[PDB]
Amino acid sequence: GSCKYSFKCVNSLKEDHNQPLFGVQFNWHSKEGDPLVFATVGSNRVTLYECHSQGEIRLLQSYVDADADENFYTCAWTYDSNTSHPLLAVAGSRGIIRIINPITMQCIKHYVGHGNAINELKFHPRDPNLLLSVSKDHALRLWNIQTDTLVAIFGGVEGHRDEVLSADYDLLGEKIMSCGMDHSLKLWRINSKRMMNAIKESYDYNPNFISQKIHFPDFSTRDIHRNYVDCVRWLGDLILSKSCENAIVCWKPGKMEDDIDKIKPSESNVTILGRFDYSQCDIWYMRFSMDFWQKMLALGNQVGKLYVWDLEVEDPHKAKCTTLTHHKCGAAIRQTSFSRDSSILIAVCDDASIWRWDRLR
Amino acid sequence: GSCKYSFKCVNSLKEDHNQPLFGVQFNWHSKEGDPLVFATVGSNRVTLYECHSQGEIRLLQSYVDADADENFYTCAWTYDSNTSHPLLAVAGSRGIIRIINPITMQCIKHYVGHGNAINELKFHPRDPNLLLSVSKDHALRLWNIQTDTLVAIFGGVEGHRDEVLSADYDLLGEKIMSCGMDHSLKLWRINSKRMMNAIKESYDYNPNFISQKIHFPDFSTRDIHRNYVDCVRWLGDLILSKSCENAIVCWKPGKMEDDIDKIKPSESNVTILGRFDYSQCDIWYMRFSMDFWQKMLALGNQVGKLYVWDLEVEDPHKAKCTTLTHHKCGAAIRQTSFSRDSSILIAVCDDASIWRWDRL
Amino acid sequence: SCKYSFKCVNSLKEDHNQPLFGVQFNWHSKEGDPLVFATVGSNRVTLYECHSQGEIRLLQSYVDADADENFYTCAWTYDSNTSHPLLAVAGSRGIIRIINPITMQCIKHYVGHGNAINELKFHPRDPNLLLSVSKDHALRLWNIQTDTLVAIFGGVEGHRDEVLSADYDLLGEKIMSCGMDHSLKLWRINSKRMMNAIKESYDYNPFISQKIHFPDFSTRDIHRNYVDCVRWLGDLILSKSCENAIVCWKPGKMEDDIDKIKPSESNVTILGRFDYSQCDIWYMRFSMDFWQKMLALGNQVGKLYVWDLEVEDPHKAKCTTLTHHKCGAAIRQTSFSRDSSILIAVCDDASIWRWDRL
Amino acid sequence: PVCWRKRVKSEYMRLRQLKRFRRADEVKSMFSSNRQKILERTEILNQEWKQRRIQPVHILSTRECSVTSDLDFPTQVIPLKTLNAVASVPIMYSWSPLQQNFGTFIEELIKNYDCGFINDEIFVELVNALGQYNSGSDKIFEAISSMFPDKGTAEELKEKYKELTE
Amino acid sequence: RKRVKSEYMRLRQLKRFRRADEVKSMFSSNRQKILERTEILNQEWKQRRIQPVHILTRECSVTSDLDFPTQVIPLKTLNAVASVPIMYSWSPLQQNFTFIEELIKNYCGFINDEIFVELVNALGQYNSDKIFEAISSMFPDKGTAEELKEKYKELTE
Amino acid sequence: PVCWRKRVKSEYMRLRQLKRFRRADEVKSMFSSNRQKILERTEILNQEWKQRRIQPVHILTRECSVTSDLDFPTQVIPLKTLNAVASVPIMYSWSPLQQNFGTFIEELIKNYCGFINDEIFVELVNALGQYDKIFEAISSMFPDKGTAEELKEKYKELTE
């Protein structure tokens, strides 16, 4: 039946470059009482905004890459444990990771390892120094940004056979699920003793380091989608993933009864629980999102419509979303982001516009 | 020489698919006092709207074809003699006809058989069960949607030699004029004894059926336009038809003195009365409209402007038209539709936008 | 900051939905008469009158009979015999038309050129002298009083590709052209050869056209791609290209006088650069006001940059950015009114934007 | 000389202008006689419409659709009814000088297909559930084979039921 | 060796400062050259009294985003520009070189037999062999003068 | 005849809907079991978040603008340019025996013969005359002008 979350559009902005904005991330690390700030990435630009009452969106900071042919695709927030400074990582076509310190307004760290473009960046949910990058070069990479070392390279003989498009840690940060253009979804456990020893020795390194080459994932499947898989996220111990077939598939490794932590790498079974159906999202690199509490699912389509599903109902795959639409919003929505308290939902588009949707209570 | 009709833009809608809307048709069968409703076709979607006071357009019903690759090009209203239900026929790129019943909200009939896509649907002005479908296969076909039979196929050795883009019955439903991509305009009479007996045997049919192929039209001409003809309508015993040359030509078969019903098929003469001139409408598949009383003629151009002519003036071909424009209306207008009382004029565009013009 | 600030008081849209390439205020208006400007786009010429409260009144508009014609530029002048204003327009098919807005008729045609005309300029001192720069690598100077072609600038050492722009100096003694061969070229028209050609252009009565093969200065070391706009800044040169900068330069060394520069001159001096962004597409022209105190250029995403040319270090000074949420089309040309009160911008979507100085 | 050539232009322009006037007068009467026919014929159509009383279209009640408006009017959302797919008829044609040559339940199986349409567990439950009706016991297996031919013929399903029940 | 590094940046800032001052005074000298010559043009402009432009079936429209209403004015069509029908010959010895227009605009087919006889009869009201030479001079496609004269005699009977 | 296939159609869909019910029940239970894992683990991360005190972000030659469709005015702030990243040049050689592989000259190439005039070359040597050893400094910093004693052949020639 009807979904319970309702939103009102209270503002819409437009950046002066008129190039597609691919990514948008709210800073979930801000303390209670500080204003909600989010970042957008598109073209060779990084922009930071501050949300206020009555739909007001204050523009705080903007950055340009010296390289005009740089094209940022994604970003991810984190913090410095020693200095309590928020940090923002950005990356894109040139395959270079940049860490920007909005407090000092400097760019503090560059990482230039990958063989090609970076498609997604994700920070470990328990260790703010461990940064995961998925790339066009068929591999994933786990960086320690406090020691400036590369902990592991997730790829090789049984890794992805084409571009890696997305990945996501589980809630407690024990395992990673990746996907890409080889139709596959692969599981990499980072709570194995090899990985656990690699992380700590990466912390113990000081110059007078070799990274751990993980060839075999702890699970793999091509049997969820029939095309490229361009976005994956964990839903507890189940998986949400999507392709160009106008559906988000909710599945789990193995048969219905199987524990995620006892799935052996040999597992040839998967179980489809259901599909979140929608329409007009068949172009590539359109990413869905969830709020912190993983109670809402948001996805934009290629003609400016914004779908929000309630994830807490008994049959989320059988319940209607609420479509958020505006007469002046017609450009493809590349990514959305909820504030930590789910009060605000921001959507960025291919025409460099920004749309603020405020939850009605 | 201003045009006496003037309109005000009172609403502008936009469907969520952002695909070109190719057809719009008011339901003229609605009885007096009932609200004015209209239908739009575009993408694989069909949508019924209701017009209300102060420019409000209520969204009533909407349908999607299960086939994701279907693209409806045209629609047409009719009614059921027995149940008094209005019916809506839709068709497009996949060459199938659907009859949708908005009272029960279900698709009650499929008609599959055309060689290819259907570019226009038209219903007989006296018989609600007689449906005309013109297609990419160079032919026209007349269906009896009561007994579900194909009455006749118009085309063949002297039919159209390329796609058929439009057709129209005369006011009393005695003849059909069709046009297409072969530069031709052909007249098919259905009040001949051969056709009237085909319509009768279609009705007296019960399975417990041969359709007649008409190879020769009762008139044909290529000497009106120099390119494809993409819209034709009757104006009494006269004909209005247009092409990409930015004019609607008003003409008639034979010479000036010749009666329409005495024209015999060998006629090599035509007579151009005048032309309704406009600008910036040189793309293909742009269709002009008329109200029920045939007092107004409306056509939209490819950059959002909407021309309206008063057909009842002394010199209709030499008279200024009313140009309806709006600052935020810049998409090609594919089709227009007057309400039966001609109080409202609806235009649908290539960006899935719907524009409401109320007369003053 | 920058000293001049503007307010967007109106936004129009012509019904053809075709790129408007040129806009020119009529600076020949006498003091007191309302400010009038003209636009060119598709096969259309349109004239407007600016008023109070942001109002812009539509006065006249013309369609070329030829549907394949595409006007690129226009230029105002006057008939000193009748003091009627005149507007010259040209474009894709390379024909110059002279429109009389008082008699609302096209009075003169000139069909000399080989291909399209990219820019039209009138002599600042002699209203009858019209300069056309064209796709056939040449500049032509016409005398529209006696309908004679005075000179053809180009040939053995002219431009080796399309000429995209040119400009008279303030007093009208010399011409500076630029084009797709990467090069800017100086053509002195105060030469005694050219002076005698202009005099006999008037003395002719029922013709000898002078072919100037060599310029009086040439450089290809300012920009590394097509130069698509050039304007004099006194004795200095302003010229841009697809590298997102208007470069202010001068022929010779720093102390070298412009009127002593020999054709042999192998040096140039680049004083500074007006830097902007997102203007790398071709045929985007910049403008100045009559008093040459402001510099305006629109970009391909709807933003309009205005510079103060009178400050200490203009090349190092910040500019005023005029941006509107509904303006995202490429601005093809701007135009100040004579008193610099109004700045008009035309865009690839047939839109017109009025900016009023505060 | 030149003077006759100017009167030729004079008299020709006059003769054509007269014939323009002649035909202009013709189409004016063509339009006026024609509108009288439109007037009477549309009145016939209208008098027939005033006899009928066709019912009005109503909005009478997981995919939806939305329509937005530039004006004061709110966004409208209504459910999207899906039109039933049209059946492709599998025509096959044979040609030879001598001759020429040419329900609900099986499409039920095809579209909610998530062994051969029926598995061993449901097959045994089906055989057992059908023993109530009826002494052949073969008529059951012949019918199950008739509707599920992919699982086997009648004698095959009988053998498999005995295998699975041992 | 780090004083070569700072003696160099010492010296290049010395010449960066000197050239910065050079263009500073270049712009200043140039500005007054602008100031003198623009007022030479402006005082020539004040001596002139140029007339103002005023408001004038094909129409045109200009819409506005703001509360100003749509404007409609007619669209004057500029007269068609004549394509000159050129010809050029070459030799080592040498190199050689309105009524008709609207006849073609309004279009054997030019003048038909019925209006041809009306044209001859009309011209005969002025006074006939000069008449046929004038007609063929105007309509050469219909035939030469003698052809036209028996063309008329054939149709008269 | 036709009655038997009537019976198996009804009995089949009876048994088929019973097993769709059963699988619908299992996915229902899977979601609700999974939901308590989400609830438990998201509050672990939420309690960890309440312990930290992260600083807030604050506002600001090239500028950027952000316009709004609504009544909010246009916002302008300066654009900070990010320092370029250097992908170092890597020359790698392979043998079945082997495998082979400060700021001032970066600034030297940016503000741009030999990188140094002869008018500033001799102004540089006399600037350092204040303080053979002199010209091995200049040539290692400015190699293109020549070697160390090409550079005092250099200075002897323009001095005279």
Where do the structural domains in chain D lie, given as residue ranges? 1-53, 115-166
Q: Which of F4, F9, F11 sits opposite D129 (nearest CB)?
A: F11
Contact C75, C24 (CB under 8 A): yes
CB atoms within 10 A of CB C86: 25
Annotate chain E with three-state secondary structure: CCHHHHHHHHHHHHHHHHHHHHHHHHHHHHHHHHHHHHHHHHHHHHCCCCCCCCCCCCEEEEEECCCCCCEEEECEEECCCCCCCCCCCCCCCCCCCCHHHHHHHCCCCCCCHHHHHHHHHHHCCCCCHHHHHHHHHHCHHHCCHHHHHHHHHHHHC
What pairs with residue A242 in β-bridges? A231, A248
Looking at the complex, report in whole angstroms how far the Cα of residue F26 sits from the nearest Cα belonging to chain D.
Answer: 16
What is the spatial distance between Cα D75 and Cα C7, in angstroms, rounded to a whole number? 33
- Counting as contact any 3 or more CB pairs under 8 A, the partners of F are A, C, D, E
What is the spatial distance between Cα D56 and Cα D53, in angstroms, rounded to a whole number? 9
What is the spatial distance between Cα C305 and Cα C244, in angstroms, rounded to a whole number? 12
What is the biggest distance separating any 2 CA atoms in chain D, rounded to whole angstroms? 124
Contact B132, B89 (CB under 8 A): no
Residue B135 has phi, psi (to 5 degrees) of -140, 175
Do B and E count as touching (3 or more CB pairs closer than 8 A)? yes
Chain D interface with E: residues with Cβ < 8 Å: 4-5, 7-9, 11-12, 14-16, 19
* Pick from C352, C293, C355, C357: nearest CA to C38: C352
Contact C186, C251 (CB under 8 A): yes
With an 8 Å Cβ cutoff, are B29 and D45 in contact?
A: no
What chain E residue is nearest to D19 in terms of C-alpha separation? E115
With an 8 Å Cβ cutoff, are A17 and C303 in contact?
A: no
Amino acid, res. E82: A
What is the spatial distance between Cα E120 and Cα B178, in angstroms, rounded to a whole number? 45
With an 8 Å Cβ cutoff, are E119 and D4 in contact?
A: no
What chain F residue is nearest to C315 in terms of C-alpha separation? F61
Size of interface D-E (CB pairs under 8 A): 34
- Counting as contact any 3 or more CB pairs under 8 A, the partners of B are A, C, D, E
What is the spatial distance between Cα B177 and Cα B188, in angstroms, rounded to a whole number? 6
- CB neighbour list of residue D146: distance below 8 Å, 6 or more residues apart: F5
Write the DSSP string, A137-152: TS-EEEEETTTTEEEE
What chain B residue is nearest to C12 in terms of C-alpha separation? B327
* Pick from A284, A245, A243, A228: nearest CA to A20: A284
**Domain assignments of chain C as residue spans, ordered by start:** 1-358
With an 8 Å Cβ cutoff, are E11 and F116 in contact?
A: no
Amino acid, res. A195: M
Give, as one character, the DSSP assignment of residue A74. Answer: E
With an 8 Å Cβ cutoff, are F8 and D144 in contact?
A: yes
Looking at the complex, report in whole angstroms how far the Cα of residue F22 sits from the nearest Cα belonging to chain D.
Answer: 13
Q: Is F79 on the interface with C (CB under 8 A)?
A: no
What chain B residue is nearest to E65 in terms of C-alpha separation? B327
With an 8 Å Cβ cutoff, are B327 and E63 in contact?
A: yes
What is the biggest distance separating any 2 CA atoms in chain E, rounded to whole angstroms? 120
Q: Which of C303, C318, C325 sits opposite F69 (nearest CB)?
A: C325
Give, as one character, the DSSP assignment of residue D63. Answer: -
**B149-154 and B212-214: which strand pairing?**
parallel
Token reading at A184: 């596959």
The vertex-F86 CA angle with F80 and F88, nearest 5°, equals 175
CB atoms within 10 A of CB B5: 19
Do A and E count as touching (3 or more CB pairs closer than 8 A)? no
Residue with tokens 């598995």: D119
If residue D157 lies in a helix (H) or strand (E), which one and from where to where?
helix D154-164
Residue F20 has phi, psi (to 5 degrees) of -60, -40
What is the spatial distance between Cα B321 and Cα B333, in angstroms, rounded to a whole number? 17
- CB neighbour list of residue B110: distance below 8 Å, 6 or more residues apart: B96, B97, B98, B99, D86, D87
Q: Is residue D110 classed as helix, strand or coil in its secondary structure?
A: helix
Resolution of the experimental model, in Å, one decimal: 2.9
* Pick from B199, B210, B214, B28: nearest CA to B130: B199
With an 8 Å Cβ cutoff, are C290 and E23 in contact?
A: no
Token reading at A4: 């319970």
Annotate chain B with three-state secondary structure: CCCCCCEEEEEEEEECCCCCEEEEEECCCECCCCCCEEEEEECCEEEEEEECHHHCEEEEEEEEECCCCCCEEEEEEEECCCCCCEEEEEEECCCEEEEEECCCCEEEEEEECCCCCEEEEEECCCCCCEEEEEECCCCEEEEECCCCEEEEEECCCCCCCCCEEEEEECCCCCEEEEEECCCCEEEEECCCHHHHHHHHHHHCCCCCCCCEEECCCCEEECCCCCCCCCEEEEECCEEEEECCCCEEEEEEECCCCCCHHHCCCCCCCEEEEEEEECCCCCCCCCCCEECCCCCEEEEECCCCCEEEEECCCCCHHHCCCEEECCCCCCCCEEEEEECCCCCEEEEEECCCEEEEEEEC
Which residues of chain F neighbour E12 with C-beta distances below 8 Å? Answer: 111, 120
What is the spatial distance between Cα B225 and Cα B243, in angstroms, rounded to a whole number? 7
With an 8 Å Cβ cutoff, are F127 and E15 in contact?
A: no
Looking at the complex, report in whole angstroms how far the Cα of residue B163 sits from the nearest Cα belonging to chain D.
Answer: 24
Q: Is B93 exposed, middle or buried (0-12, 13-18, 19+ CB in 10 A)?
A: middle
Which residues of chain E neighbour D22 with C-beta distances below 8 Å? Answer: none
What chain C residue is nearest to E48 in terms of C-alpha separation? C30
- Counting as contact any 3 or more CB pairs under 8 A, the partners of E are B, C, D, F
Q: Which of B280, B325, B327 sits opposite C16 (nearest CB)?
A: B280
Looking at the complex, report in whole angstroms how far the Cα of residue C209 sits from the nearest Cα belonging to chain A.
Answer: 49
Contact B217, B188 (CB under 8 A): yes
What is the spatial distance between Cα A119 and Cα B310, in angstroms, rounded to a whole number? 60
Q: Is B238 on the interface with C (CB under 8 A)?
A: no
CB atoms within 10 A of CB C246: 23
What is the spatial distance between Cα A116 and Cα A105, in angstroms, rounded to a whole number? 27
Q: Which of E115, E126, E133 sits opposite D7 (nearest CB)?
A: E126
Contact A304, A349 (CB under 8 A): yes
Residue with tokens 């394949």: C68
The vertex-A137 CA angle with A133 and A142, nearest 5°, equals 25
Contact B186, B219 (CB under 8 A): yes
Contact A231, A242 (CB under 8 A): yes
Q: Which of F62, F66, F70 sits opposite A55 (nearest CB)?
A: F70
Which residues of chain B neighbour D43 with C-beta distances below 8 Å? Answer: none
Token reading at B181: 């991509």
Q: Is F47 on the interface with A (CB under 8 A)?
A: no
Looking at the complex, report in whole angstroms how far the Cα of residue E125 sits from the nearest Cα belonging to chain D.
Answer: 11
Contact A56, F72 (CB under 8 A): yes
Contact C251, C219 (CB under 8 A): yes
Which string of b and e fits B143-163 if b means at least 16 CB within 10 Å? bbbebbbbbbbbbeeebbeeb
What chain D residue is nearest to A327 in terms of C-alpha separation? D68
Beta strands in chain F (DSSP E): 63-68, 75-78, 80-82
Q: Which of B318, B320, B325 sits opposite E63 (nearest CB)?
A: B325
Size of interface B-E (CB pairs under 8 A): 18
Token reading at B51: 């017009």
Q: Is residue A18 classed as helix, strand or coil in its secondary structure?
A: coil
How long a stretch of residues is chain E? 157
Contact B163, B108 (CB under 8 A): no
CB atoms within 10 A of CB D159: 11
Residue F129 has phi, psi (to 5 degrees) of -60, -25
What is the spatial distance between Cα D79 and Cα B61, in angstroms, rounded to a whole number? 8
Contact A247, B68 (CB under 8 A): no
What is the spatial distance between Cα F87 and Cα F98, in angstroms, rounded to a whole number? 24
What is the spatial distance between Cα A266 and Cα E92, in angstroms, rounded to a whole number? 92
| Experimental technique used to determine this entry | X-ray
Give, as one character, the DSSP assignment of residue A34. Answer: S
What is the spatial distance between Cα F5 and Cα C99, in angstroms, rounded to a whole number? 89
